[PDB]
Design a protein around this ligand. Structure first.
Ligand code: TK6
Length: 133
């Protein structure tokens, strides 16, 4: 009953500061423009200890499956090859990506009827709000 309140299909409804987050990560101009337009669906499911998070997008589709606390390889939608670890911290899913000596953290939390996604790179934060689809 790990992650029950996250499971489902979610649609992006608002975004703030995402272009600046992407810049800070190192995403190039054209990818930022096309990625920033997308209104993805995020599909979260659990089977035993394995959590799957899919992003269904007009930009890129992505899918990751993982066990909490257990590092995995991820190719991000902007084509970074990263080493990722996702944990639960006080009911928040904390996703850390490491690559080329850099690190970024994406937090997913349930707040009211929303799934709030906070993306942090150094001093830059972006907040993205998803609603049930
Ligand atoms: O899933 C989200 O809403 C947030 C989120 C965080 C990071 C990234 C994406 C999306 C995909 C687009 C490319 C930018 C870098 C990777």
């Amino acid at each position: 009953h790990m992650c029950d309140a996250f499971v489902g299909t979610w649609k992006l409804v608002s975004s703030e500061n995402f272009d600046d987050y992407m810049k800070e990560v190192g995403v190039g101009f054209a990818t930022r423009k096309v990625a920033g337009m997308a209104k993805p669906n995020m599909i979260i499911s659990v089977n035993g200890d394995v959590i799957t998070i899919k992003s269904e997008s007009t930009f890129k589709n992505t899918e990751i499956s993982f066990i909490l606390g257990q590092e995995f390889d991820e190719v991000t939608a902007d084509d970074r090859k990263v080493k990722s670890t996702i944990t639960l911290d006080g009911g928040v899913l904390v996703h850390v990506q490491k690559w080329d000596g850099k690190s970024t953290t994406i937090k997913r939390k349930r707040e009211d009827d929303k799934l709030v996604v906070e993306c942090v790179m150094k001093g830059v934060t972006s907040t993205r709000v998803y609603e049930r689809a």
